[PDB]
Amino acid sequence: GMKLFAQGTSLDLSHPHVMGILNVTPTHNSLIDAVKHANLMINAGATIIDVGGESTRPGAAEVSVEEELQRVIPVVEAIAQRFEVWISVDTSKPEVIRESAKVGAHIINDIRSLSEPGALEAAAETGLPVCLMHMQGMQEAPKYDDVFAEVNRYFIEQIARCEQAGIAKEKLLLDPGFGFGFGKNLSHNYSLLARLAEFHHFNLPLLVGMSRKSMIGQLLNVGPSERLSGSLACAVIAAMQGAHIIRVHDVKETVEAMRVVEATLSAKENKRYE
Amino acid sequence: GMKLFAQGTSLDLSHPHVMGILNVTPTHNSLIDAVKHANLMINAGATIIDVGGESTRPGAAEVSVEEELQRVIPVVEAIAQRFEVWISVDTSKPEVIRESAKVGAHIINDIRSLSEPGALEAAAETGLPVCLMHMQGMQEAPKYDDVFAEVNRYFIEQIARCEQAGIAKEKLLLDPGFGFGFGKNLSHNYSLLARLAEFHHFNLPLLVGMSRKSMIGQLLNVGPSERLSGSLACAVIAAMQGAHIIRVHDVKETVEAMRVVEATLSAKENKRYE
Ligand SMILES: Nc1nc2ncc(CO)nc2c(=O)[nH]1
Ligand SMILES: Nc1nc2ncc(CO)nc2c(=O)[nH]1
């Protein structure tokens, strides 16, 4: 029943949506390969595309302003021209937010939740949906009084901060920030996955992304390439609880698992596992 | 907290157990390959082994008595000699039940729920745990007043029938009979998967097996070899609800998904998703 609206089109969150990842970093063949990877993800079943001109996993470098315009914008521009899928942009600079909205972007997905100077002001001018994600800080993960309580308290503060800028509450999306890069260890990560359905009291969409993360690599004791089954198990658990968007690397397999989730949630009485 | 007891050892159903499938049908190299496949499944994480001298998927042939002794018994006998895993036997004849219990079998897993003449009497003499599975009838699946109500009513009748023979209720195991070979179509199969946790009112173990079945092949529209992701999604849904044994073909991936399930059920408040 929950819908997202952007660029004269809608996203019906009645079923779980799979959002494929498309990193555009180290440009002649960097654009052909981007359109072809995006094409492959659409044919596998992806309904959203996460174009991010920055890798910020702990220990990754900084990208100046002009650098992100040169890769994010032509990629975003190329997707909307030829495809129907929704395009989310992983950017924190206000200039990339303004230019992504011009070339046809749908969702503003900021890893920093629009904390950079001018970022929140830009995201409101675009009128686009913004995804708010929680994060604390290659260093360690801090200590919490209770990881679920603080993430919740981080939200109420962020929704209130959004509405103060003109971004209506109905445009927002929430993401707990799974991963040992946003300041949460293995116990904190699995506590959030276990209590995900409680986050629905906000009555807002739940973007979730745990694809190939450390919360699967450390538990299963496998390299970064053998984490498919664990990522699928994570995605099903989140979708079983009513997560609306699942941000994954392996789109074909995730989409297959989602269809089992839908066929399961369709026969249930209340469409959600608590 | 629920335990199974057989052959002087125990099975602690505090975590989901993965039961690998080992079919012994069309014998010189048929035994080496059986021990080696069983070995591979143990190293992948399987704690139970399903040795079945019969394939009875719709359209499969009949095996005489002496034929099953020649393959089931030496295979069961070979596993208990060299490995610690539990051995379940897919047999309906009373003679194979008596001889499997002699060579070291753990669980009597009858696809027919001991309906053959003399089968129930044998399973009681062994004192072993029996798995009761529901089934109606290459033909079609019948019409139900309500598929959950009848399967439940099929149980109460079967537990009562077991106790009348001396098989204590604490030795029994239940299995809904997922699959379009036991008389249940795509809607009936997903109704049972959606309402699995309700079956716990019996306070008994839940054996579940949907590996590579038609309820995944028909929904995803893929050949019998590309059903891994859908089978993993099914297994997680059942384990999320508290299924205790998951009967799968792909043990390494299932075991990986179960560890995510355990790590998730460990951080939850009540260890079960309803
Ligand atoms: N919304 C969202 N964005 C992310 N971006 C990057 C990374 C990791 O680099 N993770 C996430 C995530 O988990 N959720
Ligand atoms: N317990 C159990 N046994 C089975 N045996 C055979 C087959 C299919 O040949 N399925 C099952 C099953 O789903 N559960």
Author numbering:
A (entry chain A), B (entry chain A): 0 to 25, 33 to 143, 148 to 284
Paper text:
The sulfonamides (sulfas) are the oldest class of antibacterial drugs and inhibit the bacterial dihydropteroate synthase (DHPS, encoded by folP), through chemical mimicry of its co-substrate p-aminobenzoic acid (pABA). Resistance to sulfa drugs is mediated either by mutations in folP or acquisition of sul genes, which code for sulfa-insensitive, divergent DHPS enzymes. DHPS catalyzes the condensation of para-aminobenzoic acid (pABA) and 6-hydroxymethyl-7,8-dihydropterin pyrophosphate (DHPP), producing 7,8-dihydropteroic acid (7,8-DHP); this compound is further transformed, ultimately leading to tetrahydrofolate, an essential precursor for DNA and RNA synthesis. All three Sul enzymes adopted the (ɑ/β)8 TIM barrel fold also shared by DHPS.
Three SMXR isolates contained an insertion of six base pairs in the folP gene that encode a Phe-Gly insertion between residues 186 and 189 in WT EcDHPS. Given the similarity of the modification identified in this EcDHPS variant to the corresponding features of Sul enzymes, we studied this mutant, dubbed EcDHPSinsFG, in greater detail. We determined the crystal structure of EcDHPSinsFG at 2.73 Å. The crystal contained electron density in the active site corresponding only to only the pterin ring which we modeled as 6-HMP. The structure revealed that the Phe-Gly insertion was localized to the ɑ6 helix, extending it from two to four residues, and the Phe residue was positioned similarly to the position of the conserved Phe residues in the Sul enzymes. Comparison of the EcDHPSinsFG·6-HMP complex with the Sul2·7,8-DHP·Mg2+·PPi complex showed that this inserted Phe was positioned 3.8 Å from the position of Phe179 in Sul2. Comparison of the EcDHPSinsFG·6-HMP complex with the YpDHPS·DHPP·SMX complex showed that the inserted Phe was localized at 5.1 Å from the closest atom of the methoxazole group of superimposed SMX, while the backbone carbonyl of the inserted Phe was positioned at 4.2 Å to this atom of SMX. These observations indicate that the observed insertion of the Phe-Gly in the ɑ6 helix of DHPS enzymes would occlude sulfa binding through steric repulsion, similarly to the mechanism we established for Sul enzymes. To validate that the Phe-Gly insertion in EcDHPS contributes to sulfa resistance, we cloned the folPinsFG gene into the pGDP2 plasmid and introduced the plasmid into the ΔfolP strain to yield ∆folP/pGDP2::folPinsFG. This strain demonstrated increased resistance to all sulfas tested and co-trimoxazole compared to that of the ΔfolP strain expressing WT EcDHPS. Simulations of the Sul2 WT, Sul2F179G, EcDHPS and EcDHPSinsFG apo enzymes revealed that both this point substitution in Sul2 and the insertion in EcDHPS decreased ɑ6’s flexibility (root-mean-square-deviation). These results suggested that Sul2F179G harbors a more organized binding site for sulfa drug binding, while EcDHPSinsFG provides a capability of this enzyme to adopt a specific conformation to occlude sulfa binding.
